Amino acid sequence: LYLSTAPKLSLFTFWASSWHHDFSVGVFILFSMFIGSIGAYGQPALRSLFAYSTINEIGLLLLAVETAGFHTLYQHLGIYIITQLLLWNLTDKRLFALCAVSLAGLPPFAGFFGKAWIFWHAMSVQAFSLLAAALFCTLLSLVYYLRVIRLFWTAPVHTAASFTGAPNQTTLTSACAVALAFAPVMLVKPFVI
Amino acid sequence: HGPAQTPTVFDKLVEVTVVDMNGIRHRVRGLQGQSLAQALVEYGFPDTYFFPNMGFYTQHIVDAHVFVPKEFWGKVQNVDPESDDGLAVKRMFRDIVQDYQRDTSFFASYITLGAEHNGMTVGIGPIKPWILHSEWAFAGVHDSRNKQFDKPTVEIW
Amino acid sequence: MFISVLLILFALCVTLIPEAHYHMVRVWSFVATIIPMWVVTWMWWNFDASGHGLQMLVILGRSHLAFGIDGVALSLMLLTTVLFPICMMLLRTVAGFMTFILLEVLVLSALCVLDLLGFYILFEASLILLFLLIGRAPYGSLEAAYKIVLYTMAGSLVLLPTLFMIYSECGTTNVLYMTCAYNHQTVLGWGLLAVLAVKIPLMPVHLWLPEAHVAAPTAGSVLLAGVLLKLGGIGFLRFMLPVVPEFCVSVFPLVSTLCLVSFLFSTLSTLRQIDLKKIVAYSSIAHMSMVTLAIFSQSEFSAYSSSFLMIAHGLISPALFLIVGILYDRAHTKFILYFSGLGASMPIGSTLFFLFTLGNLAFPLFPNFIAEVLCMVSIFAVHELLAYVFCVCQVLGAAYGFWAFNRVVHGLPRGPADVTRTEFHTVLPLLIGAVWLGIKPMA
Amino acid sequence: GWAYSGEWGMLAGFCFGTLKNVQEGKAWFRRPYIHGAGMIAGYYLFKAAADWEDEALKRIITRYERKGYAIPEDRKELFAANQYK
Amino acid sequence: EAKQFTPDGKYMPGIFSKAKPLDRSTQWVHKNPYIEA
Amino acid sequence: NPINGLKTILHRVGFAMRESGQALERVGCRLQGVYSFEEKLNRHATVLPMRHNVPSLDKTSWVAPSGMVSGSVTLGENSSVWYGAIVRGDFQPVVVGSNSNIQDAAYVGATSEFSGPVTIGDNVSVGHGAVLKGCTVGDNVLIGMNSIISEHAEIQSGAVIAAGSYVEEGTTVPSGEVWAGSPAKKLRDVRAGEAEYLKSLPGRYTELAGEHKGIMKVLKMKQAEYFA
Amino acid sequence: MSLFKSSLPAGFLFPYRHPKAKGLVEGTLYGLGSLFRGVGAALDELGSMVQGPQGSVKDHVQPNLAFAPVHRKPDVPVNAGQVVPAPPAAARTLKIKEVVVPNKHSTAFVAANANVLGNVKLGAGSSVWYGAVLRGDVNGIEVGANSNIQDNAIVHVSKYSMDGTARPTVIGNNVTIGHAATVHACTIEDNCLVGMGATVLDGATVKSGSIVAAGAVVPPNTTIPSGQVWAGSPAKFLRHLEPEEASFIGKSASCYAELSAIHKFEQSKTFEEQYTESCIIKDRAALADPSNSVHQMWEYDSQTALVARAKR
Amino acid sequence: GFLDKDSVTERVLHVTKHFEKIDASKVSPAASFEKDLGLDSLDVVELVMALEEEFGLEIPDAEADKIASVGDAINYICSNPMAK
Amino acid sequence: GVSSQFFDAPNGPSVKQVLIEDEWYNRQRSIFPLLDKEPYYPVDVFVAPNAVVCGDVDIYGGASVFFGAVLRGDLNKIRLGNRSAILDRAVVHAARAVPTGLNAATLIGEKVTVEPYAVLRSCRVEPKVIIGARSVVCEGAVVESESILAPNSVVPPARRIPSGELWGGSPAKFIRKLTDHERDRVLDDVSTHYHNLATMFRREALEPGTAWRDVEAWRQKLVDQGEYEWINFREQKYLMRLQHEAEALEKLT
Amino acid sequence: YKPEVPGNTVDNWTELRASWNKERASSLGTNYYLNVAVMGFAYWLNEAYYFPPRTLYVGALVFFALYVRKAYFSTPYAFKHEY
Ligand SMILES: C/C=C/C(=O)SCCNC(=O)CCNC(=O)[C@@H](O)C(C)(C)COP(=O)(O)OP(=O)(O)OC[C@H]1O[C@@H](n2cnc3c(N)ncnc32)[C@H](O)[C@@H]1OP(=O)(O)O
Ligand SMILES: CCCCCCCCCCCC(=O)SCCNC(=O)CCNC(=O)[C@H](O)C(C)(C)COP(=O)(O)O
């Protein structure tokens, strides 16, 4: 949970502030996108599934980087960090599918818009190649995201009770991170810029 | 429907001789329609004798590694090697067993006991160390007293 | 807007109802869908055909979400709001009520959208709902949901770069300014064609529907049959023609030939179907292809004819699905060779089967007949060859229709008895609406 | 800033308390103090968001004009405005 | 021959009735294995 | 029933206010550092309300501390529910008239999803440990110990139910009949002395229940003496 | 004298109730807490009163009815319980001079939720389980040693019957009573087993070493000899005692005696001790972390979560 | 059943073949250690040692005591789950 | 003959013990451990205040234990499946061993409903099963899924209950075949009905309640009188453990 | 209704055991080698980004075509005693 958020955030910020180069990273973006998508499709293990999902998301962030426009980069990083925060402190499994739909780019929640402005800026430079690759990888994400949904939505509801006190010690942060469906209201406007 | 004898558990009672990895014979009573490994858990085998299934939408299913003698080979329900379930089984061979593989290596989750299985004898197959997630792993050492039957739940998460 | 928000909050109160009082649960769930029907009635009473081509305009600031009413959207809303209570009458779980409430909300919001990005966002917000609906554990098929969801996502992902490109080109996402700016019509046109050729069943990318509409239960089946295909036609009419005409023109031979081959192959494929539900599934394809060709013809009155045909199918086909669902539920199977002697067994139900079969076959005293007449008028004015192709194969659909009807209805009596009061009530709105629109639709 | 931001925040806090009781198996309406605190938090947070939009927009117009991109005054009102939209 | 109702309505499920209760599944067909295949 | 809605909203608001007050008193106890509130003492309730729906108890009626009633329970004049018995009216109303005994750990209630309201007459003796679900009973019937009465069956006034028998659903038994068996059936008619014993049965239960109430009142006096 | 018997503050040592406050900080905090308590109680009562008739019932503790008296009657012979003077308040208020309470052997164990009242004798090591009722009000109840009353069983007597013979119920030593069993006006001899859910009627008597099948129905005034097994409704003789079944009854006696002892141990604990145990479990789970910072300095006792010695 | 009934038999015969106290042709696929071979308990122990050495297993003393025939050894090996 | 004291408790021995006849108000706990056997219940479990639950008992999902019911898992492990109904004053018990030779634990499958006054002891209850009132299943018997057991029915030990059928009687016997609809929905119907009732009861849970005030008032009075006593259970337990060790070591040689 | 699994159970299980009686090594070496290769030669594609799109897509199709899947990877060389 720590690793997915902090060093990535700091490195993106330092890149945005004090970095320039005279090259491209597009082939590495292709590597990340394709490999992460295929692996997250093919790995039955939930840990490795989320690992390859993270690889695909960091590839998406790199694609956003290569075409500049760091505003979408920032907002998508924030959304993904919110989702990761919601992920690793889960006690009920009913909300677990909300993470998938916030990662699979389903419309009504923030993952969709976070991928959406990224696509908008990619088209703003007409980066046809990487935009098409990102679209295809986004499609491939949906398979294992629906698999996640099946695994932890269409199941009997059961949650173990605490015994050593600390009764569901992370309800507050969980339910707070859940309130991301209300974010797109403020998000749709030119906010992060 | 007439004087048909009352239904008793004896008519569905299945007995299998199971020998541990330490070479100790053990008597186990099984029931028709249920998996062998479920009864194995029901007997008191240590948690180290089991492992998660490596398939999709089946990771809540436990299993144990056993050897099937030559006679009972045909009683093992067939599985397509080309199938996704077959791919999960092959991943199980690839990871759990490694060079512990024997031509009698089999998985108890695909053993549905019946009348013919009465009197069948199998033993436990050795396994390599493994880890699934934070709450269920295998050190590679069978030094434990905790019963797999004592786990309240099977958390894939 | 305020009224709409009141309905939105009022519908959500279903979950807050304790499950102990089932009677009130059913009452509340039904009334929540009842209200929008009266609201749309009030809108229609409020509309002016002597007024602007758009009326009841409202915009939610810089949040896109442009809502306005034409005749097409109002009629589609009316038909949907008629359909939904019947679907509610066929459900028994709170989850189904919530899913269908959200689906109805999304459909209504998209029906009067005026923002292309808004349509993009609002339309496919129900894809997860359909996924959960179709692949239910005891009776559904996961494969059908997988199929349809992947097809819809593929279409939307193809469209999105075009949508954002035209947004940047014109600086906004409102149709009334998108229609007024110069743009690279070609790319957006391909995006729109891809999405609305996936949504409306068009060959070759149409194969999700036969599995989906059959694996789903009766309520979802009626929803999918009568609503989501018409989202494609209203999509064309509201967006593609007003925005990018040159692409529409240069693609017209392609669209026409694709629609024709779709109609022909679907019509021929239907005869080899061995299940009633699959037969009903293939039936809608020809209607949608006819609607699309009528829209693309633009000859004399294309929009009105297309709207008439869309209303006609959304009226008649749900009755076919109702009969199929009744027969399956009170039979536990959908396989044809277990249906025989239904007229003596189900007199009124079999009579309704006959009537709605004729409705599917475009016969006079029915809205479908006038609908296809107007569509063929529009097609003929463009060219007579396309109109002949539509006219020549009229026999081939009625072939399978009559064959299946006679096979399952006449013969040795075996199976369920006739329909119940609830089933006749569910049938009733479609019969009355079809009669009313086939006698005096206008005045 | 948006007109109904604080109402949106209160609705978010309402759902927040609902799902907090969900996560502990309690009835949705139990522990109303949590509901009130969450409503206050959401109201203030989304008011802050509404004000931050105005802050960012003023920053945008200032930066754009300083670079040399001078605007006719008619569209400056699209940025130089604390509009209660 | 069962009594799934009372003399004044009041549908009785008849869980412990010896007779086979008429239900929604009453008119289900008996599937033919060849047809199913 | 808009009155039901008004009652319900009043109950919900008062319930939330009770929540807030009790929580704040828990916080105050924490500040005072005494955790007697934390005690896992038994919460078993003689009178358990259902939202706004409250049992109605005659001033001459009585319930044991172990005895419990829930929902709109109506116990008539000099009507007794003995120790540990559970008569439930949370879902369906149960109506009981005058001089009726619900013996120790006997069940009368309606919890089948289609169980109608339960009616109990007068001079009604339900034996120790009998189960009654969705049934109506006339006056002056001996309901046997550990017996089962199923739904919508009519026990006409004056019959006999032998102990431990099972009465099938909707199976009406006419008056003055002795019935036995799990597939219960008529055995014979009531005898004169047996009927006389039944007629003398109620008053002994009445006097004993009054005495039990007196002893319970004494014990509650001592309970108060501990803190009062 | 674990390691810090003389240094740990009383708050840690006495978590149920802190001692009297000393400092101004402590006194002000106590006053604020008292104000909080009062305001919360006022709010609770306001909510109850606006709530209406339903709130009229309050949280009141249940009386300890496992040992409850019954009425000393002239005709009823006290032979199982024992007459005791009533509390002075009862006599001065509602004219109660003599009450009869059960004669219970100290080694016996009764669950905290049972209903035992009046003329009852409990044998040494005899047990009464949860949810049962033993109302000795009009006659006597005699239970032998090492005799068990299982859960939700019913024991009652008859002062007046169909034949009008007030017959007490006698239970011998080493006697087993089943779960949710029924006992009324019957005599049970020694080393006997009564099935769970069975039903015993009046005038019945069971010889020693006999078997009552579960769920069976005993006819009124019927005698069943030794060495026999009876079942049916009404019961019929089926089989004789197998050699192992008497030893099975003895095993039941032994094992349920052990169970009664363990349950008495679990039940006879004070509230403050239970809270101490809860806190100990909490600290033990806090010590379940191998990376706990204390584990390279302080070694704790497993049973008490207190430092016994340092590790290094 | 854990191994083939034939290959085990030929391996047993081969390991029997290299004993100085035995006759190479007197060894049969099924025989008796005492009556046929005239070998004592210690010779039987040595037999068990040789068989286990070839088959790479471990046999406790009690099982060896139960073993007194060639078929006994073959069926014991085929019943051993650690067979290789 | 066992002493009521346990020096080897998982929490330590009890220093002061209180006689039951000295109790002036009932202190009956609904749920409590048994030595090193501890309960396991869902967060949204309905436990009636007069119910009895102890020790190594497993409960899954939306199951419920109603008024006066007993689940005494002292001799074995007890498991309760998802959304399983236990009505008022029923007992789920077990033994140390059974003639069948299987685990003596009593297993209850998911969506299994139980009427009041039922005794369950060392039986395997497959999911989706109805249990009647005054009905008992003995040790080692198995009830197959999709089955309905009539009230006042006796199930002898080591017996079998074939699925898809209605059975009853004393002893139990065939009655009729369960209809396909009955298998499909009715069992789940009862499950959901009684779960809805259990959640209805759970909604108005004022826990822990306010009755502790009077006991707190009495203790506070004792404090004012000073007669309320301070006892360090931790250090007294340490002294008792040391005394046990010393006395035990002083009796071998 | 249920379709039958094709083939024999014994043959299919034996195929499931084809090329699996082998110890799994550590994944560290592959990871180190991949990182070393990227650190050493990825600069060769620096001039690539200007190349005509047709050639780049041809290269992409070739690279996709010649790939070999790491999971379930087996060789005849795993069970031979000599080259
Ligand atoms: C919690 C504490 C537990 C204890 O320590 S003991 C308290 C609870 N113990 C019990 O369950 C006691 C009753 N158990 C037994 O069943 C026993 O004692 C019961 C002994 C007579 C007999 O149980 P068995 O397992 O020995 O069954 P049998 O072989 O004796 O059965 C013979 C016959 O009697 C019938 N029978 C057997 N048991 C019963 C019953 N119970 N009721 C009615 N009819 C029965 C049965 O129909 C049989 O005929 P069929 O099935 O037709 O062939
Ligand atoms: C590195 C090695 C170091 C060795 C140091 C230890 C050496 C110990 C040697 C001495 C041990 C003994 O003699 S131990 C004494 C053994 N003698 C007895 O027990 C009395 C009866 N004789 C037997 O049992 C014989 O073994 C026999 C007649 C063959 C029975 O034939 P079988 O066998 O068919 O049974």
Ligand SMILES: [Zn+2]
């Ligand atoms: Zn009595």
